[PDB]
Design a protein around this ligand. Structure first.
Ligand SMILES: *[C@@H]1O[C@H](CO)[C@@H](O)[C@H](O)[C@H]1NC(C)=O
Ligand SMILES: *[C@@H]1O[C@H](CO)[C@@H](O)[C@H](O)[C@H]1NC(C)=O
Lengths: 50, 40
């Protein structure tokens, strides 16, 4: 899963079988880190219209 | 290519209401199943 974003700690209550989460656009919203199963939120890097 | 899901709850003949079952396993076994039975 390639991408670009701010990775954060998250409160998302992933059940023990769930590996990643999605937004309604099908874009990934969170991931469980494969080497140590912390649940990371994914947010796009800070942006806006100029 | 086989799945098992489960749930387990205390109760007050199948009880009413709602249940959502988490996967226990995917088994990569690809076995042809048409028939089944239960151990007692
Ligand atoms: C991966 O390796 C690190 C360092 O050896 C270890 O702390 C971690 O528990 C390992 N994770 C898995 C899923 O084996
Ligand atoms: C499973 O075996 C039966 C005969 O024992 C056969 O009719 C059936 O086509 C087989 N299943 C599949 C997916 O082909």
């Amino acid at each position: 899963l390639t991408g670009t974003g701010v990775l954060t700690e998250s409160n998302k209550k992933f059940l023990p079988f769930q590996q990643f989460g999605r937004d309604i656009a099908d874009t990934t919203d969170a991931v469980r880190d494969p080497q140590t199963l912390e649940i990371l939120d994914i947010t796009p890097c800070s942006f806006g219209g100029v | 290519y086989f799945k098992i899901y489960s749930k387990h709850t205390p109760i007050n003949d199948l009880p009413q209401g709602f249940s959502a079952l988490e996967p226990l396993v995917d088994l990569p076994i690809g076995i042809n199943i048409t028939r089944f039975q239960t151990l007692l």
